[PDB]
Amino acid sequence: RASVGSPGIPAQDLPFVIKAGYLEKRRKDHSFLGFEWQKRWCALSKTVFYYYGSDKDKQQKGEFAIDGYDVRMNNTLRKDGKKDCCFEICAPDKRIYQFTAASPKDAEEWVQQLKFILQ
Structure with missing residues (x-):
C-alpha cells in the first residue's frame, strides 16, 4: 500500500470532470454476496478515474x-x-x-x- 492515501473528495466537488455517469464495475473477489457487477458512479477528473457508490457520496470508493x-x-x-x-x-x-x-x-x-x- 501507499504511505499516504488519496484524499476523500465528495462526488459533487470533483474538479475538471470530463465525463461522468453510472457504470457497473466487476468485483474482483471470486466469492461474494450480491451481484458480480456493482453499480458505481464514475467520474473522470482530468486523468484520474474516480468511482463512488452514488453521485451524492462524500468519499470515493476508490480511484486511479x-x-x-x-x-x-x-x-x-x-x-x-x-x-x-x-x-x-x-x-x-x-x-x-x-x-x-x-x-x-x-x-x-x-x-x-x-x-x-x-x-
Missing part, C-alpha cells in the same frame, strides 16, 4: 490515474444481453478495471473519451 493505461471494448466479459455494453481499462501492471454501461453507445463513448486521452 489512467496515465499509460490502455482501453478496449470487450464482448466476452459477460454472456447476458449486456455483452456489447462492456469495456475495460488496463494498467501497465496488468491490473484491469472492467465496466458495463447502459448501452453499446454509452460504452463506446467512454472508450472513445478514454482512448482519445491514452496517446
Whole structure:
C-alpha cells in the first residue's frame, strides 16, 4: 500500500470532470454476496478515474490515474444481453478495471473519451 492515501473528495466537488455517469464495475473477489457487477458512479477528473457508490457520496470508493493505461471494448466479459455494453481499462501492471454501461453507445463513448486521452 501507499504511505499516504488519496484524499476523500465528495462526488459533487470533483474538479475538471470530463465525463461522468453510472457504470457497473466487476468485483474482483471470486466469492461474494450480491451481484458480480456493482453499480458505481464514475467520474473522470482530468486523468484520474474516480468511482463512488452514488453521485451524492462524500468519499470515493476508490480511484486511479489512467496515465499509460490502455482501453478496449470487450464482448466476452459477460454472456447476458449486456455483452456489447462492456469495456475495460488496463494498467501497465496488468491490473484491469472492467465496466458495463447502459448501452453499446454509452460504452463506446467512454472508450472513445478514454482512448482519445491514452496517446
